[PDB]
Write a protein that binds this ligand. Structure first.
Ligand SMILES: CN1CCC(c2cc(-c3ccncc3)c(-c3ccc4ccccc4c3)nn2)CC1
Ligand SMILES: Fc1ccc(-c2n[nH]cc2-c2ccncc2)cc1
Ligand SMILES: Fc1ccc(-c2n[nH]cc2-c2ccncc2)cc1
Length: 338
């Protein structure tokens, strides 16, 4: 066991191993607070997240377990990963706090797109890295479900990592089937989000800046058109099908006119991501092979993930049992090779 030390940062107590020095508050990001720090063992700048109230309710205890299980499984250059996870507790009896450690990332995609316009070459590289991480995530049967610019961490090398995967105006990046509350949406919802992000990087403008869920769907249908007969056959909900058919029909717009002046390969890919029928949307693996990424695509360096057991999601357990399971996962953590 290492030696811990205690301090207060922004009305919050931080107790960390002495290997982490020079903690500076970076902001209350996520179900937790984040501090930048200097890792004396490696010489690298790290981000340390302290979870808030991790075992206060069954909801929190399960979510804490879910996030730790998820972060421990991900080992990919374009997905946020765990350098370390620790607790100051010496036993389960006094186990009450969980701290997570990853490499410090300088900014998010929202900070970049707002502060500067991006050339087509940067768009290629950024979207390529999103899709490469997504191929990995999806191969483990994990859906992100909330991809957006602020969940994409980026540093000055333009290296990118996906944050907050698999966890839990209205969402401008959410797939339309979600706005319609379809309960059997699948991993292609993330491809829709990537299309919206890509469009924004190319134009500098939010593609679908809806004011609420109804307006969000309206804006979407204005660009991609109202559902065709093939898609209508797949809608079981009677209220939804009746609503969709009651709308005045909208034609699909030509993306080459909407994104005039963009690389026509970029436009072709957007067409393939922003398809209304989720069954016809391009997958992450397929998108990586698209000619738009010809200068980065390497089929021998686009790996998939090990199998990921999500069976715990269907279990009904006590707080103390979720806490014990989380404790087990803290103690069994093995840091990645230096
Ligand atoms: C709109 N917000 C979108 C979310 C965002 C954010 C940044 C960070 C973050 C990540 C990396 N380098 C700086 C900040 C984190 C975060 C921090 C530490 C971690 C340690 C282990 C595992 C995961 C971790 C996630 N989590 N969330 C804040 C802004
Ligand atoms: F997600 C949904 C669910 C139901 C509806 C709906 N069905 N019939 C009428 C509506 C409707 C129309 C306008 N604003 C809200 C709801 C619209 C969207
Ligand atoms: F208006 C729309 C917009 C999107 C969809 C849709 N796209 N992919 C899957 C669906 C879908 C939506 C609701 N129920 C089943 C399937 C269906 C109707």
């Amino acid at each position: 066991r290492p030696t811990f030390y205690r301090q207060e940062l922004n009305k919050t107590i931080w107790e960390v191993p002495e290997r982490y020095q020079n903690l500076s508050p970076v902001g209350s990001g996520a179900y937790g607070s984040v501090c930048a720090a200097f890792d004396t063992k490696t010489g690298l700048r790290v981000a340390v997240k302290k979870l808030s109230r991790p075992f206060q309710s069954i909801i929190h205890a399960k979510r804490t377990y879910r996030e730790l299980r998820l972060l421990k499984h991900m080992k990919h250059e374009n997905v946020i990963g765990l350098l370390d996870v620790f607790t100051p507790a010496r036993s389960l009896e006094e186990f009450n706090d969980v701290y997570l450690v990853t490499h410090l990332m300088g900014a998010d995609l929202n900070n970049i797109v707002k502060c500067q316009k991006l050339t087509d070459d940067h768009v290629q590289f950024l979207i390529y890295q999103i899709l490469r991480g997504l191929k990995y995530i999806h191969s483990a049967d994990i859906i992100h479900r909330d991809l957006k610019p602020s969940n994409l961490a980026v540093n000055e090398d333009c290296e990118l990592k996906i944050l907050d995967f698999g966890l839990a105006a209205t969402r401008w990046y959410r797939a339309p089937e979600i706005m319609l509350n379809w309960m059997h949406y699948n991993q292609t919802v993330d491809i829709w989000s990537v299309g919206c992000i890509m469009a924004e990087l190319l134009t500098g403008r939010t593609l679908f800046p809806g004011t609420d869920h109804i307006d969000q769907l309206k804006l979407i249908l204005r660009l991609v058109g109202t559902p065709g007969a093939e898609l209508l056959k797949k809608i079981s909900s009677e209220s939804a099908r009746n609503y969709i058919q009651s709308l005045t029909q909208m034609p699909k717009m030509n993306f080459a006119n909407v994104f005039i002046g963009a690389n026509p390969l970029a436009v072709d890919l957007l067409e393939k991501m922003l398809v209304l029928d989720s069954d016809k949307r391009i997958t992450a693996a397929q998108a990586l092979a698209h000619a738009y990424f010809a200068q980065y695509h390497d089929p021998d360096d686009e790996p998939v993930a090990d199998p990921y057991d999500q069976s715990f999601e269907s279990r009904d357990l006590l707080i103390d049992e979720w806490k014990s399971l989380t404790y087990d996962e803290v103690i069994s953590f093995v840091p990645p090779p230096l």
